[PDB]
Amino acid sequence: PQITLWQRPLVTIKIGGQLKEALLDTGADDTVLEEMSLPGRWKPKMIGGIGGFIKVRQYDQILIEICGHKAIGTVLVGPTPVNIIGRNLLTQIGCTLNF
Amino acid sequence: PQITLWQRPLVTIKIGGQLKEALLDTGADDTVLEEMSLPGRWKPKMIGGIGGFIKVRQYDQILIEICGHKAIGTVLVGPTPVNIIGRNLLTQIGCTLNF
Numbered sequence: 619p620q621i622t623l624w625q626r627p628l629v630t631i632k633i634g635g636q637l638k639e640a641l642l643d644t645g646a647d648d649t650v651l652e653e654m655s656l657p658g659r660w661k662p663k664m665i666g667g668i669g670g671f672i673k674v675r676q677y678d679q680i681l682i683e684i685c686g687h688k689a690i691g692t693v694l695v696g697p698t699p700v701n702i703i704g705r706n707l708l709t710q711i712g713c714t715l716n717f
Numbered sequence: 718p719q720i721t722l723w724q725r726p727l728v729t730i731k732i733g734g735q736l737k738e739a740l741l742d743t744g745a746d747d748t749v750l751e752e753m754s755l756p757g758r759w760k761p762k763m764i765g766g767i768g769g770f771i772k773v774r775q776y777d778q779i780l781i782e783i784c785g786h787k788a789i790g791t792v793l794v795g796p797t798p799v800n801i802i803g804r805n806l807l808t809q810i811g812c813t814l815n816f
């Protein structure tokens with residue numbers, strides 16, 4: 619699609635058997651999701667944004683279908699008030715910003 | 718411009734007599750720029766991101782020439798590490814997410 623930004627760029631994602639809406643984000647290097655029960659081993663890692671830093675669980679090689687497009691990447695899980703799809707996955711579904 | 722996301726989407730902006738480089742961000746509702754010198758009255762505002770809540774000086778009606786396109790809007794100035802061009806100006810330069 620072509621998503622104008624008059625409203626938050628939200629899309630449906632399917633990850634670990636669950637359905638969630640996530641923000642398409644060019645200002646996020648990483649994908650960070652709300653806490654869910656995602657199966658597997660996870661290294662600790664910490665990220666920053668405004669306000670500070672949060673501790674997240676790094677899950678790597680997770681498959682996630684963003685708008686029907688599938689991708690596999692690292693997904694950080696942690697206390698975030700919105701789920702975020704960052705550039706590490708946005709490049710796999712072929713996403714470009716245009717103006 | 719068509720901008721792929723392998724690299725951070727940074728574009729140059731000319732704001733208040735000064736040259737800056739900022740992040741084109743579809744995950745920011747607002748525009749938040751590094752603490753800088755800008756003329757005007759401001760009102761305190763507070764924004765939230767991950768990790769927490771920063772207090773910022775809110776400015777309305779500031780002209781920003783983003784990637785050599787002009788636009789006028791509210792600009793927040795405060796303790797960020799990267800300047801962000803959020804959706805309140807991204808829609809003025811006509812920007813779209815495309816996949």
Ligand SMILES: CC(C)[C@H](NC(=O)OCc1ccccc1)C(=O)N[C@@H](Cc1ccccc1)P(=O)(O)[C@H](Cc1ccccc1)NC(=O)[C@@H](NC(=O)OCc1ccccc1)C(C)C
Nearest residue numbers: 645646647648666667668699700744745746764765766767
């Ligand atoms: C999502 C994270 C993976 C991403 N962080 C990240 O990429 O870290 C890079 C970094 C940081 C520090 C040092 C070194 C490197 C991140 O925090 N990105 C924000 C922009 C940014 C900040 C710091 C460094 C680089 C870039 P963002 O993607 O624009 C973030 C997305 C988001 C997170 C949480 C909640 C909502 C939305 N927006 C924001 O934080 C804006 N907040 C915002 O739009 O919503 C207000 C809100 C909504 C809901 C609840 C509470 C508050 C803010 C710029 C005003």
